[PDB]
Every structure is written in C-alpha cells, then in structure tokens.
C-alpha cells in the first residue's frame, strides 16, 4: 500500500496547485473589473455630467448553477472523508 | 486500512470535480465582463463622443479577504502533507 500513499500525496499536491492558479485568476479578474470601473468613473460619468439596456440575466443564472455544482461536489467529498475514522 | 485508501481516493476525486466547476464559473464570469465592456465600448462611448460615482471599495475589500483566506487554508494543507514522508 506504500505506493498508494505516494500517489495520493502527489495527487493532493497537484490539486493544491490548481487551487492556487484559480486564486490568481480571481485577483486578475478584480483588476479587470476595477479597470473598467476606473474608465467609467474617470471619463464617462464626468463627460455626461458636463453635457447634462444591459441584459445579462441569463449569463448570471448560468454562473449561479455552475457555482452551486461546486458546492454539491465538496459536500460529497466531506461525506467520504468521515468513513476514514472507522 | 484498505477502506481508508478507497475513501480518500473518492474524496480527492470529488475535490477535483469541484475545482473544475469553479474554473468554468470563472470563464463564464469573463464572458460577462467582456459583454459589459462590449456594450460600453460599442454604444455608450461613441454616443457620448458624438454629443461632446461608482464606489465599490467596500466590496473589493471583502473579496480580497476571502481570497486571502483561501491562501491560508492551502498553506496549512501543505504543512500537513510534509508529515507523510516520516
């Protein structure tokens, strides 16, 4: 069973690296959101004020379900781990 | 201990599936960001140019802390794995 231990260890380490990469993607995503906010706040709003629809509901619904699936998988992971103590 | 091996294997596989689902959520998120950028760049900016605040600091701070927590948990995961070699 020593090889099984070695393989699980390597598998866990690769899982953790994948998680690190998603975290980085999220930080980069915020930078993009802030960049867009920046341009709107710096140029679009001031110009309109001097002079004086966006429908993504289907996309947000798709994202909500995808995130929920992630929850369903983690919950199942935890159930299996409880069987180790016995 | 054979059952413990089987349970850890199943638990790891479910963890990996949850990671895949988060990746998909992130790709969909970018599609949404690009869609919004698209409408701004295609209609809002051109119209204002022909004619011629957004405060989310508290939300971004909340996201930064949540992402940091993810880092704190992975670091702890790695510390435990080092105890396997002994």
């Amino acid at each position, epitope marked *: 069973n020593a090889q099984a231990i070695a393989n699980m260890k390597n598998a866990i380490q690769n899982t953790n690296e994948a998680v690190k990469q998603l975290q980085l993607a999220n930080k980069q995503t915020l930078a993009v959101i802030d960049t867009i906010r920046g341009e709107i706040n710096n140029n679009i709003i001031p110009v309109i004020n001097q002079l004086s629809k966006i429908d993504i509901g289907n996309q947000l619904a798709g994202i909500n379900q995808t995130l929920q699936n992630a929850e*369903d998988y983690i*919950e*199942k992971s935890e*159930e299996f781990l*409880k*069987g180790i*103590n*016995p | 201990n054979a059952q413990a091996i089987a*349970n850890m294997k*199943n638990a790891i596989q479910n963890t990996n599936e949850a990671v895949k689902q988060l990746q998909l959520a992130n790709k969909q998120t970018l599609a949404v960001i690009d869609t919004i950028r698209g409408e701004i760049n295609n209609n809002i900016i051109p119209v204002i140019n022909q004619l011629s605040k957004i405060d989310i600091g508290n939300q971004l701070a909340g996201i930064n802390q949540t992402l940091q927590n993810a880092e704190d948990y992975i670091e702890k995961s790695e510390e435990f794995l080092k105890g396997i070699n002994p």
Partner: antibody, heavy 120, light 107 residues
Framework: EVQLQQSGADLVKPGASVKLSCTAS????????IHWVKQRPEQGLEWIGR????????KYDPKFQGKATITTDTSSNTAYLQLSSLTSEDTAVYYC?????????????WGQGTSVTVSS | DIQMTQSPASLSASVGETVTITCRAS??????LAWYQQKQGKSPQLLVY???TLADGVPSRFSGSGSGTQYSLKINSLQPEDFGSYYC?????????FGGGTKLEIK
C-alpha cells in the same frame, strides 16, 4: 453490534409540540450522519432532513423547514427531532436512520420507528 | 430540486416469475441511486446501492443498472419472501427525496 434504538409514542392535541428521539449503540454519533424520515400511514416516504453532529450543521427539505428541526447531544450519542404545531396530517411514523458502512451512498441502519398521532 | 418518479404503481406476479421496477429522475444524479424494501410493517432495509451494486446480505435474485436519469431494478425467480414495497431515492445534493414506491403482490 450497530443499531439505532428509537423511542416515543406521543398522543397529543392539535397545536401541541412533540419531541421524538433515538439513541446509538455500537458507534459514535460524531462520525456519522443522522437522517430523519416521515412515513404517513399509506403514502410512501418523505425525507425530512439531516444533521452533522461534528459541528451541528443542519439541512432540511424546504417542505418541513418551518415545521420541524433536528438537534443532537454528542456526549450521550443521542439525536432528537422536534416537531411543532402538530395537526391531523402529522399523524405518522417517524424513522431515525444513519449512514454507517455505505458512506456517501445510502441510508444503512434504521430504527424501528416511532408513532405520533394527533387527536381531539 | 431533483425528484424521483417510480413508474409502476403496483405489480402482480406469481412465485417464480420475473419482474422489473423502473425509476426515473428529473435531473442528473451521477449514479448516486439506492433501492430499499419494506414489509407490511417494520422499518425498510437497503437492498441495492450506487445503482449497479448489491447491499451486503442481499440474495443474487436482486440486481439493477442504469445511467443518466434512467435506472431500474430487476427481481429474478420471485420467492414468497420477496413480495413487499420497493422504494428508490437519491443521494445527490439536497433534498435527498424518495420516489412514490411500487407495491408487488402475489397473484
């Protein structure tokens, strides 16, 4: 061996509160999930909900979310189902069930069930 | 949510006959389906889990298979002791509900 010993035989008036319970033998409550199921006399089975005694993490079928709650006492290896606002429909048989060997797949052990009735 | 449909309301068969019970899902269960049996009284017991397996102690007379949203149970060479009520439920996400159930009688 592993078993669930369920108890109760509550005869109550409409509007009454009822507490049903089960105890474990042969295993530690902390290492398992406890589920509750409601069987109306002739109408199949409805899942109520379950708890994780390790951290009192509960989850319920929305149908009973405002009807009943599930709690536990780890130190005595026991579990409880608290029913409120009992009416005629609630007359039924409740079962305590747990997952022992078939982890992640199916309810394994069941209690004998407890019957609670509501009458004037 | 994900609901289960137990199609046969009631089956009627003599001893030695082969019958089947079919169960369908309103969504993808990822093969986390289990079958239970109950007598006229007493608690139910687990017969098949993971929808492709047998529970410990269960006779080879009981088997099953399926995928996606379509699953089934088969009972070969029915014996007098095999007559009772059958149920299907899933263990994916929540709520982990049950199908209506099928009653198999001797006749």
């Amino acid at each position: 061996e592993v078993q669930l010993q369920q108890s109760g035989a509550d005869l109550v008036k409409p509007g009454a509160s009822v507490k049903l319970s089960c105890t474990a033998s042969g295993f530690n409550i902390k290492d398992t999930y406890i589920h509750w199921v409601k069987q109306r006399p002739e109408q199949g089975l409805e899942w109520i909900g379950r708890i994780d005694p390790a951290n009192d993490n509960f989850k319920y079928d929305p149908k009973f979310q405002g009807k009943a709650t599930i709690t536990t006492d780890t130190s005595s290896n026991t579990a409880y189902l608290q029913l409120s606002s009992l009416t005629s429909e609630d007359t039924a048989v409740y079962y305590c069930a747990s997952v022992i060997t078939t982890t992640g797949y199916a309810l394994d052990y069941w209690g004998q069930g407890t019957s609670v009735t509501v009458s004037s | 949510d994900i609901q289960m449909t137990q199609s046969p309301a009631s089956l009627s068969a003599s001893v030695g006959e082969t019958v089947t019970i079919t169960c369908r899902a309103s969504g993808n269960i990822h093969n986390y389906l289990a079958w239970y049996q109950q007598k006229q009284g007493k608690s139910p017991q687990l017969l098949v889990y993971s929808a492709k397996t047998l529970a410990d102690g269960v006779p080879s007379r009981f088997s099953g298979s399926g995928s996606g949203t379509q699953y089934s149970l088969k009972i070969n060479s029915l014996q007098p002791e095999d007559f009772g009520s059958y149920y299907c439920q899933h263990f994916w996400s929540s709520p982990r509900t049950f199908g209506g159930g099928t009653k198999l009688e001797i006749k």
